Amino acid sequence: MQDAITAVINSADVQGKYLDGAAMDKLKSYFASGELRVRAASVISANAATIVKEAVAKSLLYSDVTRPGGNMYTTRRYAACIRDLDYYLRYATYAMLAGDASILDERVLNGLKETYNSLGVPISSTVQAIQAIKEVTASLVGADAGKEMGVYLDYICSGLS
Amino acid sequence: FGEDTVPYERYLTPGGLQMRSARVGSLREDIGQRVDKEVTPRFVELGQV
């Protein structure tokens, strides 16, 4: 796992070279985005449960998944799906705050598709739920922070697809 | 110069040549100076990837 600063540092180290102008510019860009990321993370922490609730309501209710036969049936499976969405939201917020997707790659994506295939859960339905979480988060946070969260959420969807 | 050549400056006195080619501009790096062949540091080369 690595934020933007650590990613730049590790890349420069692997080349065995100091922090040149490009690396300094990238670090300055991250520093400029830091306040935005902090405020967005605070807002999402404040409204984390509501975001998942609204996304599920507007994306994954009153359908076959909720109905018996769908993999969201029963309190157990519905809670598992809700916890999956909460995990997605929290880890996407982590990735947004760190300015890098390595945390998602090593803590989320690895084995996610394998477990989803093993348990037969709807990858398409999960993708749509992630979409709905994306719109809710964008609405709550704003435009630019919304896009920053959405890029990571779409990365999660692409990895899971 | 034959019957068809315009004359031209063929020789220069040393004083005139010095006036022309001894100013800060137009002075070669190697004329009256020890030119040390610049080379990257050996440790920099060793640590270079």
Ligand SMILES: *[C@H](C)[C@H]1/C(=C/c2[nH]c(/C=C3N=C(/C=C4\NC(=O)C(CC)=C4C)C(C)=C\3CCC(=O)O)c(CCC(=O)O)c2C)NC(=O)[C@@H]1C
């Ligand atoms: C909800 C949007 C969709 C859905 C979800 C759902 N998932 C499971 C079970 C699992 N999901 C995971 C995935 C992860 N666990 C993690 O800790 C992380 C790391 C970031 C991920 C990605 C795992 C490991 C499981 C199995 C273990 C568990 O106890 O959850 C279920 C239940 C499956 C079952 O048989 O119990 C459900 C319902 N299902 C849908 O239909 C939605 C589209």
